[PDB]
Symmetry: D3
Subunit: 282 residues, 6 copies
Amino acid sequence: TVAKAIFIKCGNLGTSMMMDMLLDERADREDVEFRVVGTSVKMDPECVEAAVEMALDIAEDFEPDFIVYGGPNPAAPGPSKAREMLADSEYPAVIIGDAPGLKVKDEMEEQGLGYILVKPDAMLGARREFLDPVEMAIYNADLMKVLAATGVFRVVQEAFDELIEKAKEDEISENDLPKLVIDRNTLLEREEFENPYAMVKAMAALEIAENVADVSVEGCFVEQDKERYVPIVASAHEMMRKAAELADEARELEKSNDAVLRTPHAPDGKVLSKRKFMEDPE
Amino acid sequence: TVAKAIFIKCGNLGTSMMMDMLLDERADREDVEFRVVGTSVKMDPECVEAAVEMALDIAEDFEPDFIVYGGPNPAAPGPSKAREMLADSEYPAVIIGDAPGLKVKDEMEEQGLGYILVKPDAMLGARREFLDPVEMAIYNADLMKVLAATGVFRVVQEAFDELIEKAKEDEISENDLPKLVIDRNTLLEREEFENPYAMVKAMAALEIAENVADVSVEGCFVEQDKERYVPIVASAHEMMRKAAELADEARELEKSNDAVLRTPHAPDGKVLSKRKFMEDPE
Amino acid sequence: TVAKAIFIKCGNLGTSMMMDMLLDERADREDVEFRVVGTSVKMDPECVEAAVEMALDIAEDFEPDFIVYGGPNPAAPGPSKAREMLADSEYPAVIIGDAPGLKVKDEMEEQGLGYILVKPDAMLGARREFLDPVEMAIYNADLMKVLAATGVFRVVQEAFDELIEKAKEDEISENDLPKLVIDRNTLLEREEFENPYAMVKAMAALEIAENVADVSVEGCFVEQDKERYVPIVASAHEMMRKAAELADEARELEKSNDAVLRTPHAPDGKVLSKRKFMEDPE
Amino acid sequence: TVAKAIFIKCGNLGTSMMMDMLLDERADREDVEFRVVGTSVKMDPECVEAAVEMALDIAEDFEPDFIVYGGPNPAAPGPSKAREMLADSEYPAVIIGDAPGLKVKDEMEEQGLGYILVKPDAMLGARREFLDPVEMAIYNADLMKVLAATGVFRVVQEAFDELIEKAKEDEISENDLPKLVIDRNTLLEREEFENPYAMVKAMAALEIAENVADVSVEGCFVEQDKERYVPIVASAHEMMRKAAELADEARELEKSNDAVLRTPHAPDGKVLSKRKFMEDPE
Amino acid sequence: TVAKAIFIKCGNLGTSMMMDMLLDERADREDVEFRVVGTSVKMDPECVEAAVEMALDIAEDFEPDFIVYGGPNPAAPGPSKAREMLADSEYPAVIIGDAPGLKVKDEMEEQGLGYILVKPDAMLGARREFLDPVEMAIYNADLMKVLAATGVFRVVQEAFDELIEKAKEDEISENDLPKLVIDRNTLLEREEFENPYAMVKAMAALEIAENVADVSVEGCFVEQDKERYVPIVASAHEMMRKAAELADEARELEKSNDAVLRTPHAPDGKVLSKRKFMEDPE
Amino acid sequence: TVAKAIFIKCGNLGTSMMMDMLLDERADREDVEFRVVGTSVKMDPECVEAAVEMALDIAEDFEPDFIVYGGPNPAAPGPSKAREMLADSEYPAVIIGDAPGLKVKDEMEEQGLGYILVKPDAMLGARREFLDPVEMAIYNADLMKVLAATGVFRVVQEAFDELIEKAKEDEISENDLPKLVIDRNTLLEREEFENPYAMVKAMAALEIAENVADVSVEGCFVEQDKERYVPIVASAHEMMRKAAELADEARELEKSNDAVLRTPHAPDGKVLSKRKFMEDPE
Ligand SMILES: [Mg+2]
Ligand SMILES: [Mg+2]
Ligand SMILES: [Mg+2]
Ligand SMILES: [Mg+2]
């Protein structure tokens, strides 16, 4: 049984940027096939629709078990446009978004949509005077580390793999669709870190990443004084740089304990596990 | 006028992952329109062909000024195939790959297509016993930081931006296509850094990332002993982690001098520029 | 003219812990005389009452031109007790506290009191499981580095030094009493740092120290599960240690420029100033 | 039952600034009660006298089991005075000071009072050109982090906690008064660290802390050349800054082995203990 | 018995600098006696010969069991002259060198000479515009840190100690002379690190150090543009500096596990061993 | 004219390890010619005498303009024999040593000997239980870093460079030989650092390095308790490691200001100078 899916990427979110590859890390998974379509960073209602179109168009011949839409803020005009377009289609779907999507959480639970909401996947301080192309990449590097090293990506990966198994049953009922809200507190009900302090550091790191969103919003929308909003959006980035460093420190702690949890995929798509470095993943 | 292009992403590369977004960081560039399609990590000749087919098929009603294919090693089966196809299209193309693509560098200039080969966009330690989803994201986060902070991404940004202008002139000839190879010494032609040690550190960070590739290749393809190849690929990731630190340290030196070079796009697509934090992009 | 004041300290805060010393760092000011009194970490309406009485008690003979009450949460049973005792007395008072005092901010202005609220002065995760004397001290160590190196203490110092000038006018009216609410944005209005990146790292530090409260409260007053609130009060700590790191960084950046602002008191209470290490303060 | 003590503080010391708070970290010990009074930084024999009388004056209604005087150089004019007074009172006393108080170490056990001499509690570089309120605070944050994380505070905690138990016994004899001198070698008699290197890093931290004293004393009392003494006291601060990094490092090693010793006070005053994070204080 | 050897040092190499010392670390061995001669940094033919001549002159009365010649590039004129002179004597000789010695590896074997070529012992950026004494000393401090903490020096000590035993029996055949080529992979099969991440970080450090070689060579012998080769050689030095931090990071992991291997010499020369800090060597 | 000198190395000191090499950092000086002899780490009278006799035997035909003897404790039996032997010869001699050489400063002057005593060149923790070959090399790596990056080596280079010029004129009188004692305050009067904080961090580094000496002596010649001296000598090393980092932070402060001092030799021996990276030495 070969499962299939289509990821639609509109806008830019750390979780959307990795979501699919967290599933096929070495491109050796022979139990799955993906198609990814998007219009880049543009998430306007015009483009957002053009993408879902390419998605439905392709799905015709492709025939996926489900379609994932990932992008920032599921409550915006663009994402909302696609949020509805997918509920109308014949394909089961999941919505990957940030905290700004809790506003439409109940709405998505009714639209019959599945979703994964990453609170710590904060919006970057986009203010021409500050966020140029390089700064953008830099910010996403740090956010990527935080989400990766804290275990958030493993939580996402396990969600999309637990669904691909149900997809193999060609029966993805709305009860089989994910409905997650990831945040610092998530780690409290997991076993990601063998080292306790490595866990509270990952937690402290997630709280900070979440706090970056408010700072970015204030500086991008509320504040309009150039002499005050440029410093604000930049202070948001300095915070994420520390969030990442906190995440890196946690990992190193696992390393010292030789307990870095690794869970790769076998060619058959089975999720294997290991703690010790020289221990085979079984 | 407005320029258009389509990005195809098969397999993953640090540049391939950010290429499109590096041309519209805040998504408020009204003089460009992008589309992105691919098969994720998979890059075998079948998924590749199916992908290039997805791009050509949509290039019909999209009518792109140029098609961009990004992914690891433009000399392997999958990538070579995609070079064959796009080479024989009414659409001008550009190939984005790493160092292993220097083998087919002449064959490409022949196929009448442009290329951007980033030497420091190393191959990761893809070995089931070491690379799981999380570790795969941890690495890309280090590579992203080194590629961005060392100014490599600025090189690529400039590239596709200068092409977008000649594309608005409805004059995309092969003399206008890029034939670039990026490595540690690219920074010597640049003015990226104002502090001499920030550049020297960046050069160091690039040299190290470029070296990472030989280590990943060895562990994945040459060493056959489990006890030896797992430590080797892991050490390749330890090198990339330090390259990122060096890059970050280069960035902080620039902050120290208040000379952080920023080149954001104006709403019309023209690349502005500034050094001082509160300088206002001119 | 020798101004005099009495500091009443109940419970603990980083701002109350160093408030009087920021006014005579080397004990060489011959224009001031302070009398500090407190009941230690206990701030119940019972102890708090005994302290204010002990303060008004000696005040008669001392003759302070103003009295300062410092301790956490101005809207608490103890603090509110002392908050009315001072409004009733014939001594001009100023209330120094954390964010929880904002609920009674407008209430203090009618009581005729002055106030300075240090938002980043967050309450620690005081759970018997995690917080012991050593952990408490470590916490305040980081918190101190934050309030100091971020420039917050130079705000408190400035506020009381200006009040000490009015106290010399033998005229401290309600309009001469401070009414400040310190937070991350407070730096946007000052010229503390010569380096713009030092300030944004400072903002980031005060932004994270302020968030620390939310976590401390969630783990001390909301969460009841032992397996959860311990990791919670401990994660709040990591946040503070990392915030102290960013403060340190900002301070080091000003050092690489030798633009480290220093403002010492002359023996006559005159506040001098200097940026360069080798320049004498004027 | 409940024990009571009064803490007198003139001038500042890292140990005096924390002593009473190291006894009731969470303010939930209902088996003790303390009063705190002082003159702040000032510590001349007059300000000292006034403060000691401010403490004797309230010991009447307070009726303390023992009085404690905290401040630098217990052999100088100010402190010598306070030794006189408290020595001849119906209240048992304890003197907490630094290394310069080893001169009067004989005279103290003579005056019939207990002492706590912290050699690593070095004097800071007091020179108007270098030390402003902030530098003053920053220095204490470093000395606070060293004394706490190196386990020195644990020594003082237990010292006053053990005295507090004999005080509830209605029997505070002079053979029950403490006679201790804390130094790098004090850690050789404890079991503070489960990781030997953390111990060795802790010793190094305090060894460097002790030496900070001579650099300070020199630049303040010996060198009279501006161009030489400013850099000298500054170097004492730089040294202490590094000692704080060493102490932090010791702490982290223990976090890697999850052996962080924690000894909180039970609500009834009896000190508990633990090593593992989720262990629950026994 | 007492073994006797003569070490000739011409030119400078991290390993030739420490070689003899690594064998009698505390100068309390009773089974060895060494003589060291050389011409400092100069390794031209005239000098090398003068140096080897000094050695052979001392050898007459000193009667060395074996002779060691160490210094850069065993294939250069000066070194080659040394190989010819020592291969022509009655004394068993070992050549200590860098990667460039591989060119004459076959030639040294035909000469009955032993050798230990350390590839990570990279040449420095010897350009007059960049390399002054201080920098030359800083580079070597980092290279020394690398060669030691990664375990490369233990390999060298071992090779020699074994040759010292054979010498004690007056049984040193050409087949008893070492023929080693040390590099990153050499660590894969040692019992150096108890922590795997320490080993991995040590390999990463050796890989980088080895790479420094090419960069220095490029900026010293290839690039002729002042504006190009200066930043180039300097970047080589930034690399070594980071290799040293990796080496230190590996050493700090062992400490966290209290598994720092220590193989000290007994007064009788026997090589003891230990792992735990408090564990006595045996 | 070519200047000739012979360096004798008995025992090991950071300065005696690098002294001759600091005088010809790239091996391209045409005005100097050196011969280096020694008995490695052994500095007992028998060895030191053989070392000096080797030197005097060479001097016959080599005819040095001056001779330098380097190694620990000029006052010990071995070094004392060297002093006596050298004082009785016709060759102007200099004695390089550490703090212990101060005991015989008066003797050396009465002997017509020159000397350079580096107090920060501290003795290591030479206890069999803690110091093996690798730890001995790690300590030296840090010591070298401290002495080079703080500029102590520059003072040494200077002293010998001036002595070399006089030698070229065959005019080296006893009054021409150096009589230096280097320590933290030596830096106060040098044009080493452009950044004041760089100089202050360096002083701190030298202060601590000096302190290391006392700690090593304590654990080596005082404490006889295995359980106590082992931790103590190890703490000495931890101190030197931190001193190396201070020295490293200073150097990085200079880089930030692109003000790193480089005083390389010209092919003719002239000591050039420069500050800016791209500036040419002159
Ligand atoms: Mg032979
Ligand atoms: Mg032969
Ligand atoms: Mg003479
Ligand atoms: Mg004489």
